[PDB]
Amino acid sequence: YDIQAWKKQCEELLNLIFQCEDSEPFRQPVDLLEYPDYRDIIDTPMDFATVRETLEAGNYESPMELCKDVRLIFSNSKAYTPSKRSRIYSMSLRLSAFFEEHISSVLSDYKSALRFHKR
C-alpha cells in the first residue's frame, strides 16, 4: 500500500527497456532528414528518453500518466509504419508486449494503494 512505490518500479522498468535492443528506435526523437513525413502523420511525438526525463523531473503524478506516454510511443509507431511487416514496427510490438507484461503489477499495486489510502 506504498502509493509512491510506482516511481522506482517505473524507473527500473525503463532501465530494462533501455537495455532491450528492441527499444533502440524509440530511445530518442525522429530525425526529419531521415523520416521527412514523420510530423505530417504524428502530431504528438513520444520517446523513452522523454518519458524517463518526465518521471525524473517529478512531472508524472501516477503510473497511469507514464503508461499513457509509453503507449503513445507504440501508437505513433503503428500510425507511421508503412506496413505491419516494418522492422521498426515489429520491434514496437515486442517491446509493447514486454512493457504491458511488466506495467500490469505497477498499475494494480498503485491503484490498490490509493484505494487503501481513501478507504
Ligand X SMILES: O=C(NCC(F)(F)F)N1CCN(C(=O)c2ccc(Cl)o2)CC1
Q: Does 3 bind ligand X (CB under 6 A)?
A: no
Nearer to ligand X, 89 or 99 (CB): 89
Positions in 45-74 near ligand X (CB under 6 A): none
> How distant, in Å, are the alpha carbons of 14, 34, 60, 87, 117 from that of 53?
11, 24, 10, 27, 28
Q: Does 99 bind ligand X (CB under 6 A)?
A: no
The DSSP letter of residue 61 is: S
Q: Does 88 bind ligand X (CB under 6 A)?
A: yes
Residues 60 and 66: beta-carbon distance below 8 Å:
yes
Q: Which residues make up the interface to ligand X (CB under 6 A)?
A: 24-28, 30-31, 34-35, 76-77, 80-81, 86, 88-89, 92
